C-alpha cells in the first residue's frame, strides 16, 4: 500500500539530501574516501543539507575525521546510517533526534577536499552499499530499490516494518 511507502521512507534513507539535486531530474560521482563508496555532490559552500531519513545524530564531529572534515553520522532504524561530510557548519549535536528532511548542516570544503561538495554515504551495518540505489529511490520509483540493492534482506525488513503500524 502507498501509505506504507511514506512510512518506510521516514525510516530508511532515500532521495538527495541537497534540494537542488532532488529538483532537477528526480522531481553525482562515486568516490571512496574512507573504505566505503560515497557520492560526491558538487555544490557551493553553505548549501543547506537535510537528513535523508529520521534517526539520531550518532556523531556530530568537528574534526579531520579521516579526511571527511566536519561530519555528521545519522543512525537510522534497522542498521542504516547516513554520512554527511566536508561540512562548513553543523547545526545539530550528538544525541539529537532528527526527522526526515530536517536541516542538519551546511555544505563546505573541510577535510580532504579539492573543491566544495557534499560527500554523502548510506551504510548498512558493515557491508558495502551503493548510495545511488537510495538517492534514486523515491515515491514514483519505489519498488526499484529492492531489485537494485538485493544484498539487503528486504523481505524480513518489510514484514517487520509493516507490523509496526497497527
Amino acid at each position: 500500500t502507498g501509505l506504507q511507502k511514506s512510512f518506510i521512507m521516514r525510516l530508511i534513507p532515500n532521495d538527495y539530501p541537497l534540494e537542488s539535486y532532488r529538483r532537477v531530474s528526480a522531481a553525482p560521482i562515486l568516490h571512496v574516501l574512507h573504505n566505503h563508496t560515497g557520492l560526491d555532490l558538487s555544490t557551493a559552500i553553505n548549501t543547506p543539507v537535510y537528513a535523508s531519513a529520521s534517526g539520531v545524530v550518532g556523531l556530530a564531529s568537528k574534526g579531520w575525521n579521516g579526511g571527511y572534515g566536519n561530519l555528521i553520522k545519522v543512525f537510522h532504524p534497522f542498521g542504516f546510517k547516513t554520512y554527511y561530510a566536508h561540512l562548513n557548519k553543523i547545526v545539530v549535536k550528538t544525541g539529537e533526534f532528527v526527522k526526515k528532511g530536517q536541516l542538519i548542516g551546511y555544505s563546505g570544503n573541510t577535510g580532504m577536499s579539492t573543491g566544495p561538495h557534499l560527500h554523502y554515504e548510506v551504510r548498512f551495518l558493515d557491508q558495502p552499499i551503493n548510495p545511488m540505489s537510495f538517492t534514486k529511490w523515491n515515491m514514483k520509483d519505489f519498488e526499484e530499490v529492492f531489485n537494485k540493492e538485493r544484498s539487503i534482506r528486504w523481505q524480513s525488513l518489510i514484514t517487520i516494518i509493516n507490523r509496526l503500524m497497527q
Partner: protein
C-alpha cells in the same frame, strides 16, 4: 502528557522496554558484583536477573543483531547484542543457548536465547544492559516502562532528550 496512543505504541516497538525474561527469583545491579570483563565491583553495568538455566530470553524491541558470541565461557560468555532505533542498544549475556545470528533483523518479543551461566557470571543469571549511543542507562526504568506506565523511561533524561524524540515520532505517526 499530550502524547497520542500511536506515539506511545511506536515508541514501545522501537525502544527497549519491558521484561526480556519472564521468570526470575530476583533482580540485582551488576555494579554490586564482580563485573564480567572488568573483574571488580562498582561498575555501572546494567542488571542481573537471577533465573534458572534455560529460561527463555526475548528481544526488548525491534532492531538488528549486530553481535553474537556462542560457545564462550569467558567474560560475558554467550551473548546477543541488538542495535535498536534512535541510538538504543540492548545486550543479553551469560546465556546457555543463542537462537539468533549476527546481522538478522529482530522483532520485539522474539526469542533470542536461553539464559545460563556462561562466562564470568557468578552463577545462573541473565545479564542485561540498555545503552544509548554506547552509554550505560538505568535498565530498571526501561523494564517498568509500558503503555500504562509511560513516564518511567522518560525519567532517564541525562543523555536523552525525550521531548525531541517524541517530536520525531509525531512526524512519523502523523501519516495515518
Amino acid at each position: 502528557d499530550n502524547l497520542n496512543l500511536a506515539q506511545k505504541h511506536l515508541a514501545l516497538m522501537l525502544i527497549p522496554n519491558g521484561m526480556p525474561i519472564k521468570t526470575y527469583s530476583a533482580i540485582k545491579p551488576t555494579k554490586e558484583r564482580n563485573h564480567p570483563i572488568k573483574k571488580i565491583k562498582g561498575v555501572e553495568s546494567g542488571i542481573d536477573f537471577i533465573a534458572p538455566l534455560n529460561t527463555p530470553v526475548y528481544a526488548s524491541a525491534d532492531g538488528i543483531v549486530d553481535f553474537v558470541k556462542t560457545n564462550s565461557n569467558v567474560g560475558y560468555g554467550n551473548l546477543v547484542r541488538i542495535e535498536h532505533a534512535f541510538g538504543f542498544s540492548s545486550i543479553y549475556t551469560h546465556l546457555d543457548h543463542v537462537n539468533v545470528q549476527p546481522k538478522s533483523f529482530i522483532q520485539k518479543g522474539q526469542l533470542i536465547g536461553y539464559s545460563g551461566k556462561s562466562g564470568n557470571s557468578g552463577g545462573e543469571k541473565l545479564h542485561y544492559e540498555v545503552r544509548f549511543l554506547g552509554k550505560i542507562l538505568d535498565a530498571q526504568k526501561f523494564l517498568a516502562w509500558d503503555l500504562d506506565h509511560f513516564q518511567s523511561a522518560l525519567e532517564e533524561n541525562k543523555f536523552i532528550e525525550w521531548k525531541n524524540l517524541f517530536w520525531v515520532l509525531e512526524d512519523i505517526v502523523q501519516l495515518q
